[PDB]
Design a protein around this ligand. Sequence first.
Ligand SMILES: CCCCCCCCCCCCCC(=O)SCCNC(=O)CCNC(=O)[C@H](O)C(C)(C)COP(=O)(O)OP(=O)(O)OC[C@H]1O[C@@H](n2cnc3c(N)ncnc32)[C@H](O)[C@@H]1OP(=O)(O)O
Ligand SMILES: COc1cc(C)c(S(=O)(=O)Nc2c(C)nn(C)c2C)c(C)c1C
Ligand SMILES: [Cl-]
Length: 411
Amino acid sequence: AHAFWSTQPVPQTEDETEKIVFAGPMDEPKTVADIPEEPYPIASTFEWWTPNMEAADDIHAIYELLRDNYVEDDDSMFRFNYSEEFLQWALCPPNYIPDWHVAVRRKADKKLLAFIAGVPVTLRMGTPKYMKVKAQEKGEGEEAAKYDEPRHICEINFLCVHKQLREKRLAPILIKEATRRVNRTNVWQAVYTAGVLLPTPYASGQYFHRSLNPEKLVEIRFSGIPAQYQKFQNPMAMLKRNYQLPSAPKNSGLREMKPSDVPQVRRILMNYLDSFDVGPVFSDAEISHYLLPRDGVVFTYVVENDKKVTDFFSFYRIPSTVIGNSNYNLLNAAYVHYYAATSIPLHQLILDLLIVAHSRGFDVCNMVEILDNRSFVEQLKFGAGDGHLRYYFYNWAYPKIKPSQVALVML
Ligand SMILES: CCCCCCCCCCCCCC(=O)SCCNC(=O)CCNC(=O)[C@H](O)C(C)(C)COP(=O)(O)OP(=O)(O)OC[C@H]1O[C@@H](n2cnc3c(N)ncnc32)[C@H](O)[C@@H]1OP(=O)(O)O
Ligand SMILES: COc1cc(C)c(S(=O)(=O)Nc2c(C)nn(C)c2C)c(C)c1C
Ligand SMILES: [Cl-]
């Protein structure tokens, strides 16, 4: 039972979301005028802060909080170490609302103690296709199509409470205050993801990993050596040999994206994302922001043939701190970002992703089984990991769907 989430406009059980048929809001309809103008009360020792994301030193304070207190694996072996440049890129997309970046500071020292961020996203989130089918069958097509237009909502990420402050009910307060700031801007839904089960996910996808540096991965215990490797003479040379990759990409006419590619990439991406039930809609400016190369952050390649961009792929970097091994500071992980293929098989496109990631020193390539990520798992030698990313809506009834019907990539 959930003293906080039970008070919120989300489905409360698997049993409620396995019943839902149509997309739509949960709450009573409200107005900005209904929403308190004063920030939510907190204890007298703390204060609310809006970081300025163009201030290197505010970014840095958030960076440090996340470095020491953000997402750990279950065995406390790894913790994310999102870089400052990554934080600026993720928190400041085009038309971001600074007010949606919410932090609790200690009044005395101004030590940052908690954070949560919302950025705007235009998301298609109407009734899924299979349910629209049933609706037609039933004469209920208009109810099913009512919320088909892409909606300008809020994407939540980087919720983090300082280690010393955990289990003190501060996360609910951060969430209420973020909710308030967003509703004050006339946005009523949010989308978020988590590694944990909360009430209640509309989708759930398993993690997959592709070793680029297996020796390092085994040393830090990201990876195991399978038993079958023991009935070999030299376990580690076999492993290295098995995951080896070309040093140079195989698709002729692969190069990094440039600003002039923006409209074609937008067009091929939007055509592809259109086939999923849940997915974002991006403008030219959002295609430039989210996909143009920035060093250490996001890496994006196109296939151009005959002055036409026919294929692209992208990945982004999140290094993780290796907590208990002292020979290594970091796991250097590449995360599959958006892509589209029209001219070659997806596995052929994504092999070049692995090749590039490896040649630029990444240790592993990670992804969740959304988009068409399942289609290249076996041929590219990805193995399932033990985590799941669950996808959630705030104030939005949504039927259960498969993760291969989700086209939103979380940072
Ligand atoms: C219209 C706009 C809407 C805007 C808002 C949209 C919703 C946004 C929702 C947030 C989207 C975040 C997306 C991401 O960033 S997911 C990544 C979350 N961050 C981390 O895991 C970093 C490491 N962990 C921590 O910093 C803390 O443990 C956190 C902050 C996670 C919990 O802090 P703490 O451990 O000190 O606990 P508490 O006593 O203060 O609070 C206990 C309550 O918190 C509920 N809890 C636990 N984990 C999560 C979680 N990941 N999402 C939502 N709720 C969570 C829990 O069930 C309990 O509620 P209830 O069971 O009593 O009911
Ligand atoms: C969002 O949730 C997850 C994210 C990742 C990235 C993974 S993971 O790749 O499988 N492992 C991992 C690494 C390399 N760093 N961190 C901080 C974690 C959790 C897992 C298991 C979960 C549950
Ligand atoms: Cl992630």
